[PDB]
Design a protein around this nucleic acid. Sequence first.
DNA 1: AGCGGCCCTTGTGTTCAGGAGCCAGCAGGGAGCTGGG
RNA 2: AGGGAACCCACU
DNA 3: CCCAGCTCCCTGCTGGCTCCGAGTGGGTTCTGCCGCT
Lengths: 50, 147, 142, 117, 119, 209, 238, 101, 101
Amino acid sequence: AKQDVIEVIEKAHNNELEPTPGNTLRQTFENQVNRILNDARDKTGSSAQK
Amino acid sequence: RKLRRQMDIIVSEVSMIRDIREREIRIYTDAGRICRPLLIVEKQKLLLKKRHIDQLKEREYNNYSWQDLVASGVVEYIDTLEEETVMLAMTPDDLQEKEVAYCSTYTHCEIHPSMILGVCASIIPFPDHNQSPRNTYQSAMGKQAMG
Amino acid sequence: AIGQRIVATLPYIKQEVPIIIVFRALGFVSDRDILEHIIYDFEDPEMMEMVKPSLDEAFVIQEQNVALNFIGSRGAKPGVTKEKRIKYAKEVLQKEMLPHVGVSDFCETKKAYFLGYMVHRLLLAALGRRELDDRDHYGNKR
Amino acid sequence: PGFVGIRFCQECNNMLYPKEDKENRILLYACRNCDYQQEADNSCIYVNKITHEVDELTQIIADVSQDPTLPRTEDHPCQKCGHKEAVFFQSHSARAEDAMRLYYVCTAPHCGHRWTE
Amino acid sequence: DEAHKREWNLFYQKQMQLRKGKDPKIEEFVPPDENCPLKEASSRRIPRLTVKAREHCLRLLEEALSSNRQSTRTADEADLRAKAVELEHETFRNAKVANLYKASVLKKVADIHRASKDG
Amino acid sequence: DDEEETYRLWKIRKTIMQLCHDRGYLVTQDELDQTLEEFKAQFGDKPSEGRPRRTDLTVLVAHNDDPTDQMFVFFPEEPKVGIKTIKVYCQRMQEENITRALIVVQQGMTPSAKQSLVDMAPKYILEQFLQQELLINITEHELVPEHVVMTKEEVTELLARYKLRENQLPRIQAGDPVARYFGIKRGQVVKIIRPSETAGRYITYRLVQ
Amino acid sequence: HTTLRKVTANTAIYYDPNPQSTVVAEDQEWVNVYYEMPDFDVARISPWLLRVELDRKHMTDRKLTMEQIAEKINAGFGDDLNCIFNDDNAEKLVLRIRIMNMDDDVFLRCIESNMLTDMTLQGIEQISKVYMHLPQTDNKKKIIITEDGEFKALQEWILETDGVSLMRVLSEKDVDPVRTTSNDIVEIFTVLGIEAVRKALERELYHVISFDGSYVNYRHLALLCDTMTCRGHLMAIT
Amino acid sequence: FIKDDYGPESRGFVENSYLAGLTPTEFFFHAMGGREGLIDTAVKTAETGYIQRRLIKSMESVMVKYDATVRNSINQVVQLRYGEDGLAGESVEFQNLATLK
Amino acid sequence: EDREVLRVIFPTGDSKVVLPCNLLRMIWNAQKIFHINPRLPSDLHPIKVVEGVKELSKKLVIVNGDDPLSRQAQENATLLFNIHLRSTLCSRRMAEEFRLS
DNA sequence: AGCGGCCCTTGTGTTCAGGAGCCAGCAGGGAGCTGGG
RNA sequence: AGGGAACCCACU
DNA sequence: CCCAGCTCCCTGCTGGCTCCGAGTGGGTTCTGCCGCT
Ligand SMILES: [Zn+2]
Ligand SMILES: [Zn+2]
């Protein structure tokens, strides 16, 4: 998940990131980062519960 | 900074902030600025050396005190505004060279990170293992405890 | 109206004063001098455009005594005499405005420079070249 | 076109305003407290850049290469002098929505070359 | 604010009046010559539009159609005049303001020019 | 500016036909379901060119109970309606003996015109509508339950059954959109029928005040 | 809502004494192409030019054309102004404005300020933004009954706005006037009446209460809504 | 941290469990998060209390009458039958309608 | 007809409703109390179900009175419950699903 | 021994819960009317 | 036969 | 037989007023005094 966030950051830093409809670019970057980290939290939680 | 670290003309209490992006240097001698001491890092090394620890171990006899650390320019007081311009290492392990250096331009190091806590929160054991509202609750209850 | 005017609210003056009027009351009449105190790089047209409404708002008042009378009239209890109004306005500008810059006579240049710096900071905020200040930042507290 | 600055009267050093030569159909910059006058050359008395396509590189100053809190990179050498180290940062200026773009400054003293990628 | 817009309208009308002559010097509409090939040449639908302007626009349409024909080698000639007159009449029927009418005619001219370029 | 105006006039006419039918007047099923093409056919297609003129759209309907009860619907051409045009309409209503009329305005009506409308109330009942209000039928919105005007006998039966005075019923304002749609005045009672998730159905009554 | 300012890249006021020769080469070429025959009165022309450049990107996004903008300018200002514009195929979208004969330059400034913000090209005032999405929960899907007699949920596009103009939006073509609603109850009361607002108040309160998955028996909500609407107007709980 | 660090650690992603223990920066960010909840409690209380009082005062005299109508103290009819079905809320249950679907 | 009415009341397909008497649990209780063997034919005449439900419906009164207003108000007040009762206590369901004596 | 007078320091002078929402009163404008030309 | 106000800390 | 006041009514703005969770346990200081009548 950390490496994925790094990839998203590196993409935004090269202007290769395009906003989703109804969102500025920064909101799009924050959405993607929060999605990655939420998925990581859910996956680790499931592993612990198992 | 050299003068302040020598304690020549600028007392330790004085804050000097350079805003590089702006072109302002701000110097404050007011009363009421909250500050904290930090270890000075030059290049990538603590200015605090083994000899300072040796001299402090014998502070009972030789009288070498905290004030001598400040006088020898090994520790500094940093207020919040100056902290805005500091590059701070959490521990000296951050100054060790690494495959991909994060910073490599540290100016200061923490003495010990547990110093972020006040008097009541300092009696909690393993506070870094509790949910934070629980540390807050102990911080009050400890003032209600009989001794 | 068309643009954005800059107005200073002085202590003991119950109405806002156009900023250029304050600068003139300090003894700077030429627009060039006032802008030299406010804008440090004349190669910055954007800042120049941002100050014109303030120059226009105070265009009739072109003399120090006229501006001083303006401020004194704006005072809390204006004196019918114009001489006493000017005296009161001068006392305010010398003693109640920016005391930390100086409260003695022959301090109009320092006061003008600090007021120009304040206007410059406001312009930088309005142009989005400098972030607004955080009231809860503990460096801004004592 | 770009922004159109302001002019000051040569005599009273007050701001010059635009006036036209009714008889000659020529643009004049004429003082309004004195009686000085001048002949314009731009002919564009006003500009309003809605899109605000302003160059952030012009605002960067080379001094930021001395900031110890900025990240440093060794993968974008500067063209002007080929030095291998630079600091990089974002714009952080209002009127910057896609403001995640990086800007680079060469850390070699007395070069101070700013660029973008 | 919708009242503020009304205030702007009043001020703008006042300034127009200041810039408007006391009496509207109505230049009498020029009646088209009987040789006018413009349909509805006697219409006054579009205000401040002269029949001579329509004739000039139709001449431009004629030139555009001639260019299209010579590029594509169109056979008939009578169609050229009829097509130009029809285009002008359509433009007059659609538009309702002089400048928009002229812009539409110029757009049609550009379209015909591009089609001729295409072949 | 012409197709749009034609569509607007067609919508207003359809809503007015629905309103007249709901108030009990006689309207044929073809008028209710008149398509936009049929509107362009019967009436003009160039309101800018005066075909149709708003004066061409006037309608006159008669009640189902007595043909003597009739209603006009007028469409003044002038976006703002003043006293003079109201007097004109009142004059022709008096001439033809028509006591009710709907006036569909574009921008509004002058305050004095409204005062006139209320002044001659008991003799002639003529009501005002913005055309924006008539571009849709609000009684067809899902939030609007079925409203039914009660007769005096029904109101008497209701108050006797529940042993209520009129002032104990819930209220509806005479300026309510639905009340204006049905043209009900102070002192009348409207019966409201709505579905309920607990009972299935529930009837409530509102007195016009 | 779309004002002119949302489709303009920049504006500028020049001093063009004779339109025949202009300060911009491309402008001069296209204008003289426009100035073939005297379609105007040279005397009633001011030397002050107002030049406006539009964004191709925004103009296309809203499917706007300089013809529509010119028509809007004509409607809002009339013939007293003289708007002309180049062809869309051109490299840049431009349109020139003059005034037919306060100073004319300051007057042009005032006109440009008003024209950028007050002149409306598209949309409804007070509706500042509109979102468009396909619902994933059935509470906004279109629920039908098939000819076999079963409930079926159809995905369809719905729009959410930032402001409210319920009466105007309801009258727009292609807008469903049966289901289109508002979350602003005073607007509902104004447009649809007291029984409508009674229903809408219940729905809004239910939304708030049940957002957590919590549940309150219907009779309590109904009693509150009846208390608030029984006197024919909205009675605030204050 | 360095300037313009948008990574997980810099912006407050705690990658440790409570059993492992938080690092100093994680500890501080977690303290910021927890403070938010304490504040929410200490302010929401007064807002909600005022709302509750207004609700009660607005409906305090509404009651079921012996004719089974719901009326206020002025004797105005608020509902012709309580809840539109005339039932008390304690003895109803969730059930399914078998002929709807 | 009840089904069409329900389709109007719940235009979504949500069959979950809040009603007084849990009919399914009552039927299960009856099956247990009277030792109903589901695997045998029953002695319950299907006409007895129809008439029994009609009488019961007459006995469940929220709005009393014989005038037309009272009768319609009573019909409305118990409409949903009566639809539920008729679609649960059907002769078909009683014969082939619940099998009550 | 007890009434007067309040001390608000700038007789002139910093925030007496600050902020969030309704009611009253005023200015401003426009419709309509009417006595002179 | 018995006071009161103000302010501060704290508890659920 | 039009026009300029004149009146009357409706809007829009600004200023002013009321309100701000429920209980409970401790503590402390303060409820006047001085000039001369
Ligand atoms: Zn000059
Ligand atoms: Zn370099």
